[PDB]
């Protein structure tokens, strides 16, 4: 039932993800170190982490079949609006529900509710972020459906600023069809439709987590003392 094109798309996205996600987390050692107490002691470390993650998201996105065919303007608006969502999404592979934290190789690089607050955020964001990660874990997604979800998140025609919405929608359609077909090859109805519905809802959830992170980011980065601790790529991508 998975056509030749669908297996091909899936193989591409899996290779793109394995080329942009290091499960050894070896590069976390080159970030500014985590300081667990300026009540924003984790801001330098987590800023470097976010900056690193943006670069990984751009590398993944470039390998999405069809993304190259978009204009440069549409590639930029898609990555600017999607980046925080793909970061939250891809971070689930490091999320461990033992202690509701993101385990990234060691005790130093393990981030819990209070580590994120030490970068300036409140439970207004973190509480829905943790439950999002837990709900994602419950779904028990194949890596195949995970990378398809990240790609569908990026190529969305409803992002503000998108020029060629129809092309973007045509690219998303082929990824959507590919994921729907992968589910149907794996799960019979009605369970197949219940899973696809739970994944769509997670994309809706990321939109509202996006809006809430952006409001807190705008408040945090408005203080020059916080802006100073960010990185140039974060200020460019998350700003103007």
């Amino acid at each position: 039932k998975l056509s030749e094109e669908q297996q091909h798309i899936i193989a591409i996205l899996l290779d793109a993800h394995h080329k942009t996600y290091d499960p050894t987390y070896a590069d976390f050692r080159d970030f500014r170190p985590p300081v667990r107490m300026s009540p924003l002691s984790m801001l330098p470390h987590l800023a470097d982490l976010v900056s690193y993650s943006i670069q990984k998201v751009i590398g993944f996105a470039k390998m999405i079949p069809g993304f190259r065919d978009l204009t440069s303007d549409d590639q930029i608006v898609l990555l600017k609006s999607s980046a925080i969502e793909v970061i939250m999404l891809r971070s689930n592979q490091s999320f461990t529900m033992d202690d509701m934290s993101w385990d990234c190789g060691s005790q130093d690089y393990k981030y819990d509710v209070t580590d994120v607050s030490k970068a300036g955020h409140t439970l207004e964001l973190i509480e829905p972020l943790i439950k999002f990660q837990v709900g994602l874990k419950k779904l028990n997604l194949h890596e195949e459906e995970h990378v398809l979800l990240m790609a569908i998140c990026i190529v969305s025609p409803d992002r503000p600023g998108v020029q060629d919405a129809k092309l973007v929608e045509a690219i998303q359609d082929r990824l959507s069809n590919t994921l729907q077909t992968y589910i149907r090859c794996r799960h019979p109805p009605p369970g197949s439709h219940q899973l696809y519905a739970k994944m769509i809802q997670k994309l809706a959830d990321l939109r509202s987590l996006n809006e809430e992170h952006s409001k807190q980011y705008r408040s945090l980065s408005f203080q020059p003392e916080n802006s100073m601790k960010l990185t140039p790529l974060v200020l460019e991508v998350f700003g103007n």
Binding site: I58, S72, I76
Partner: peptide, 11 residues
């Protein structure tokens, strides 16, 4: 353009 570093990472 406003995004030279992102443009660069897109090459």
């Amino acid at each position: 353009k406003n995004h030279p570093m992102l443009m660069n990472l897109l090459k």
